[PDB]
Amino acid sequence: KVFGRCELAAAMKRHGLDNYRGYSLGNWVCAAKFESNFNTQATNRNTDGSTDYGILQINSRWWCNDGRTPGSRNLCNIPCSALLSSDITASVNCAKKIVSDGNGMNAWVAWRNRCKGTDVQAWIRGCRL
Numbered sequence: 001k002v003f004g005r006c007e008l009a010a011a012m013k014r015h016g017l018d019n020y021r022g023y024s025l026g027n028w029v030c031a032a033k034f035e036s037n038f039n040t041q042a043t044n045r046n047t048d049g050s051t052d053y054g055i056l057q058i059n060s061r062w063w064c065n066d067g068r069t070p071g072s073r074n075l076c077n078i079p080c081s082a083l084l085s086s087d088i089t090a091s092v093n094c095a096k097k098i099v100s101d102g103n104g105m106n107a108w109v110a111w112r113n114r115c116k117g118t119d120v121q122a123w124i125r126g127c128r129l
């Protein structure tokens with residue numbers, strides 16, 4: 001599913017991401033925009049053989065099992081395919097674990113390089129929330 005901007009903001013808010021660990025909703029929308037272009041089905045393979053999955057590009061070395069990342073962990077206890085669903089629940093629940101792991105949203109490279117320090121409230125402007 002490719003979400004619209006305000007549709008994704010509303011879904012993220014319903015699932016408790018607004019101000020989660022102190023990160024306002026626009027941070028999460030901005031991260032999704034630049035990680036996946038709001039597409040739940042996005043995948044990207046990394047040099048180390050891991051793959052990033054879904055709207056928040058969650059990585060198989062640590063967070064989910066894809067059967068093809070040797071020596072990896074599955075700290076979200078899910079198959080990586082669950083992160084591609086039109087229902088964002090599994091991605092949000094896993095992202096809550098990631099953002100709690102010590103480095104905050106810096107775990108998402110696109111957030112660090114393209115959202116951090118910018119006017120992220122712009123990403124929720126005009127939305128009925």
Ligand SMILES: [Cl-]
Pocket residue numbers: 005033
């Ligand atoms: Cl957009």
Ligand SMILES: [Cl-]
Pocket residue numbers: 021022103104105
């Ligand atoms: Cl933080």
Ligand code: NA
Pocket residue numbers: 060061062063064065066069072073074
């Ligand atoms: Na894994």
